[PDB]
């Protein structure tokens, strides 16, 4: 089974929460009808390069339904220091500044 990449806008339904593990859980709403599709999601320190940093905790985020405005949860493992949660592609992608230390 080959998924295509979700290409619509996302929005955070709630402000990303920090877990007791030091990870961040996020819930997003997806405006597309091209589900099923794979969610673009990563951490980045450089917004020019968008080089992936940290780890995605969710094993392959997919929107499973064509249903418009469906909601999905994912968990990210941010690196130490400052970074950005980055979700989606294009001019409409959304980011959230994060900071971690331990």
């Amino acid at each position, epitope marked *: *089974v*080959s998924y*295509s*990449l*979700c*290409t*619509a*806008a996302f929005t955070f339904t709630k402000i990303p929460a920090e877990t007791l593990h030091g990870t961040v859980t996020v819930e997003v709403q997806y*405006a*597309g*009808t*091209d589900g*099923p599709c794979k969610v673009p999601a990563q951490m980045a320190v450089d917004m020019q390069t968008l080089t992936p940093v940290g780890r995605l905790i969710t094993a392959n985020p997919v929107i499973t339904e*064509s249903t*418009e405005n469906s909601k999905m949860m994912l968990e990210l493992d941010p690196p130490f220091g400052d970074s950005y949660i980055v979700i989606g*592609v*294009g001019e409409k992608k959304i980011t959230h500044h994060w900071h971690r230390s331990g």
Partner: antibody, heavy 118, light 110 residues
Framework: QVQLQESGPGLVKPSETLSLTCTVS????????WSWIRQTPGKGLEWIGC???????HFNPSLESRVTISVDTSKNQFSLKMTSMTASDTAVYYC????????????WGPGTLVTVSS | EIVLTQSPATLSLSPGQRATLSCRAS??????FAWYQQKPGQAPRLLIY???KRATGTPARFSGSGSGTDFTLTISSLEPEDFAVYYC???????????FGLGTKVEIKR
């Protein structure tokens, strides 16, 4: 908003390779899915394949073994290559943009006609 | 994959009449079908998408409806310039593939 323009050879010899190029303005082809579609006056509209730049390709299963894509984000152009052309492959060929976040194609080039003949 | 069947093949109506075009799918995928208008010598143009939404520049007399396996394009009051072939279209998920019907040709009586 987005405009696309096909360019191709017009005529292809039987069993030779077709090459087509799409020039896009109003949008960078390094984002979103872009497709090649074709239409024979004979058997309707047929999707050939698509790419999302630096992510993946997807191809019509019946045509996949004959088809190759290329992308030049500096010229905002992408290409179709289809080997072993026969008279069945005579058709109008289009490039098109996959609707961001949708199931349709929202912008189309005007189409270029390809005749397979010796 | 999925087969889209359109009917009638041809439609001949006077301007001002209401045109109703059918698209039936062999099995259901999503509730979000598209329709294209093709005029002679031109590429298809996206008319309706997600079953009921109008593409940019689609006049209000065009509307779409349907769900599951049955979808309909409605031209509430036909105009001479609506002469064209109309295609319905859907995206298969597995295997990923984009599929069109063979079209309905709308001719204008006068």
């Amino acid at each position: 908003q987005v405009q696309l323009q096909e360019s191709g050879p017009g005529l292809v010899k039987p069993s030779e390779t077709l090459s087509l190029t799409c020039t896009v303005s109003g949008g960078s082809i390094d984002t979103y899915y872009w497709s090649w579609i074709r239409q024979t006056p004979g058997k309707g509209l047929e999707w050939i394949g698509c790419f999302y730049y630096s992510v993946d390709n997807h191809f019509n299963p019946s045509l996949e073994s004959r088809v190759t894509i290329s992308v030049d984000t500096s010229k905002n152009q992408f290409s179709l290559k289809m080997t072993s052309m026969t008279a069945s492959d005579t058709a109008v060929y289009y490039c098109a943009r996959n609707q961001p976040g949708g199931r349709a194609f929202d912008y189309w080039g005007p189409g270029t006609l390809v005749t397979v003949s010796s | 994959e999925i087969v889209l069947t359109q009917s009638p093949a041809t439609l001949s109506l006077s301007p001002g009449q209401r045109a109703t075009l059918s698209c039936r799918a062999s099995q259901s995928v999503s509730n979000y079908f598209a329709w294209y208008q093709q005029k002679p010598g031109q590429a298809p143009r996206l008319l309706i998408y997600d079953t009921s939404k109008r593409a940019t520049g689609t006049p209000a007399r065009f509307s779409g409806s349907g769900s599951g396996t049955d979808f309909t394009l409605t031209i509430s009051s036909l105009e001479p310039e609506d002469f064209a072939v109309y295609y319905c279209q859907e995206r298969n998920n597995w295997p990923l593939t984009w599929t069109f019907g063979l079209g309905t040709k709308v001719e204008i009586k006068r």
